């Protein structure tokens with residue numbers, strides 16, 4: 001319902017994406033959803049081409065549920081936090097099921113913005129047949145913030161930023177080496193997003209700048225050859241997205 005549950009369908013164009021071995025630029029339909037109802041907040045999305053990829057972020061309030069004011073310092077609340085990534089792929093081979101679970105919170109910066117932090121431990125199921133499949137592998141720290149800016153062109157301009165820090169994975173150690181002599185995969189990785197979004201009653205446009213450091217744990221510069229000759233992995237660098245979508249809600 002419009003009250004708390006927010007929906008939106010979007011068309012996204014991406015440029016120089018870095019979660020895989022090779023650089024990519026795609027376009028696709030996306031289904032987004034945000035929600036906040038006393039003991040549960042949520043954010044998630046599903047992408048589909050011109051098979052299916054989705055990432056959901058559900059968190060449950062340890063306060064509301066434990067009916068105890070865990071409030072302390074700038075820490076307004078505490079959550080059982082989750083970050084689940086799923087990629088259907090074309091074969092059980094190009095599939096991914098990742099589950100980050102942990103502790104998350106909301107910070108009060110006294111500033112006119114929203115800020116959240118979450119630490120997760122994760123269990124890895126399918127992962128494109130990589131070495132870290134089916135096992136507890138790595139941790140992740142997620143920091144995200146929302147910053148209302150002003151009213152620009154009749155709509156409302158805002159800034160959304162979030163970064164995912166991953167470390168302690170066992171891949172990279174367990175993967176092989178490249179032609180390069182350097183390991184192919186990586187134990188850690190960073191993906192930082194910066195979003196400038198324009199919102200009207202229903203339509204919205206967003207520009208997204210995104211930076212990877214060893215994207216998808218692919219060790220930057222690793223030299224590989226998938227059968228078309230040697231090439232070097234470009235997993236560290238920028239890429240971006242253009243987003244046009246429509247938010248639904250009765251009047």
Ligand SMILES: Cc1cn([C@H]2C[C@H](O)[C@@H](CO)O2)c(=O)[nH]c1=O
Pocket residue numbers: 019020047053055085087216
């Ligand atoms: C956010 C995210 C996206 N992706 C990639 C897979 C697809 O190339 C694309 C789908 O949005 O994003 C990952 O592999 N892992 C992630 O954690």
Ligand SMILES: Cc1cn([C@H]2C[C@H](O)[C@@H](CO)O2)c(=O)[nH]c1=O
Pocket residue numbers: 030043045055144160162193195206208241243
């Ligand atoms: C706003 C937001 C977007 N995204 C995703 C949705 C799109 O696939 C991409 C660019 O908006 O980032 C998140 O992963 N988390 C968020 O909180």
